[PDB]
Every structure is written in C-alpha cells, then in structure tokens.
Design a protein around this ligand. Structure first.
Ligand code: 3RF
Length: 273
C-alpha cells in the first residue's frame, strides 16, 4: 500500500498502462468511498514520464472545471511524481462511442457542449492541450446504478503535452497523436489554439462514424496526404443534419486560416444551449 497525502493506492487495480504514465485506482484514506486515480511514472521511460507528469501538474493546478479531470493533490520529488486525480467512473469516450455503434446527434451535442465549456477555460487561460482524442475524454455519471445515460458528464484528461501559448506567439513542438493532429502540426509548421479545434473536429467525426476522418496507411502517408491535398473533405454520412455537417466541415479545414476559431465554435448553433 502506497500513500500520497490523504490518499492511498496500490498496484492492485490498474486503470491504465501508458508509455509515459501508469494509472492506479486509489481512495481517500479517511473517506474510503471517495475514489481517485493515481498517475505514476512509467520507469521504462523515466526521463520523459517524469517530464510529462511534471508538466501536467503545472497546468492542472491552475485548471478547475467540471469538464476537466480534477487534480486533488500531487507529489513531486527528484525521482518520483504522483498525481492524485478525480476518478471518472464511466471509462473513456473511445470505448463508449464504439460500444454504442456511434453516438446520436443529441448525445454528441450533450458531450460537445461540455467539451466547449472546458475549452472556453483553456482558451481564456491561454492554454493549448495538444493531445485531444476520444481516449483522453473521460466519462463520469454522478447518479446511481443504472442511471440515465443523459446524465453522463465528460472530462478532458491528460495534459502532459499542454502548454501556455502567448496570444501573439505560435507553437511548433511536434506532439500529439497523428490521427488527431492538425495538418499544420504533422507537417512541422507553426500552430496555435486552432490545432485543438481540428482535434475536436476529429473527435466529433469519430463519435458520428466510428472512424477517423482521414485514412492513410501510416503517419508518413497521412502527412504526405495533407501536403498533396490542399482541400480536404471528410466522408460524412449523408443523413447527418446540416448544422452538424457544417460544424464538422468548419473545424476540419486543412488551412488553419480558414478553420473555425474559438468564438465561432463557442457560439455555433449546434451547441445551443
Ligand atoms: N491517463 C489515463 C487516462 C485514462 C485512462 N483510462 C481510464 N480511466 C478511467 N478513469 C479515470 C482516469 C483518471 C485520471 C485521468 C487519470 N480518472 N479517472 C477509467 C474508469 C473506468 C473504466 C475505464 C477507465 N479507463 C488511463 C490512464
């Protein structure tokens, strides 16, 4: 049994194993019914794991929001780093959208309204996430067993690649997940917060179809694909409502100049609200 502050955990219940973090379920030492997820270093990738978990602490200690997985406490030392996080009891969006055989437009609206709320906070704080994908959107239902799925709340996780970006500057670090990366990122160009909006477009597209909007055999294929094709148009099911289709096309603009910006996203009628 390992302890971090007022919390405890063990390697008994593995929530997830990643290259740069291992996550175990734990609990409050006094209030046992308070569940937590504890992120720990992956010692097989010690340096990078330590770096990413440290970065995540720096960003999350500044981000309190329902739709961002909460950081309850943390413990950073020279040779170990732990994050004690809110436990999300619904698994991830990658699994859910697949189990449901894609999601209804009403459910997509419900989830996207929540993601938009979290993104409003990120944008106001000058923070870009850079690894948005359905695997990093977690579900949690505050109600009891067998509760209505309309009560599902979604929360953005895994801020290890996040950074502050000053509003007159651009970022250029290649990071993220290739299938969800904006074209300008995977082409090693400069980018800003609109890269996250592309990623959000890909999340919405996957919720609708089950698949990524642009299929290439590989990341190099995907990159060559963006380089060779100046106008990208994703295959969207014909029965999709016109406003959801328009939102998707606006977010999935190849050229970031033409891509939907934050104000346009926040106030898009599909999200009304
Ligand atoms: N870094 C990381 C992110 C997501 C996962 N996957 C995950 N995560 C679950 N809950 C989490 C996780 C967290 C903090 C975010 C790590 N809080 N709550 C979960 C709950 C029920 C069933 C499957 C689940 N799968 C693993 C590691």
């Amino acid at each position: 049994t390992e302890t971090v502050g007022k919390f405890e955990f063990s390697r008994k219940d593995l929530i997830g194993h990643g290259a740069f973090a291992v996550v175990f379920k734990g609990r409050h030492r006094a209030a046992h019914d308070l569940e937590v997820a504890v992120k720990c270093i992956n010692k097989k990738n010690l340096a990078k794991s330590q770096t990413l978990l440290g970065k995540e602490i720096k960003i999350l200690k500044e981000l309190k929001h329902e739709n961002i997985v909460a950081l309850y406490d943390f413990q950073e030392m020279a040779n170990s780093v732990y994050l004690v996080m809110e436990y999300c009891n619904g698994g991830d969006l990658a699994d859910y959208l697949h189990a449901m055989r894609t999601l209804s437009e009403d459910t997509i609206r419900l989830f996207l309204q929540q993601i938009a709320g979290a993104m409003r906070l990120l944008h106001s704080k000058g923070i870009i996430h850079r690894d948005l994908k359905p695997q990093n959107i977690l579900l949690s239902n505050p109600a009891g067993r067998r509760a209505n799925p309309n009560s599902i709340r979604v929360k953005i996780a895994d801020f290890g690649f996040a950074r502050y970006l000053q509003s007159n500057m651009m970022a250029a670090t290649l990071c993220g997940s290739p299938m969800y990366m904006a074209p300008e990122v995977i082409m090693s160009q400069h980018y800003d917060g609109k890269a996250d909006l592309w990623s959000i477009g890909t999340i919405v597209y996957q919720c609708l179809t089950g698949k990524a909007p642009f299929q290439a055999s590989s990341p190099q294929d995907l990159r060559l694909f963006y380089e060779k094709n100046k106008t990208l148009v994703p295959t969207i099911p014909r029965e999709t409502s016109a406003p959801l289709r328009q939102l998707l096309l606006a977010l999935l603009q190849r050229n970031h100049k033409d891509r939907m910006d934050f104000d346009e996203f926040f106030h898009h009628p599909f999200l009304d609200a």
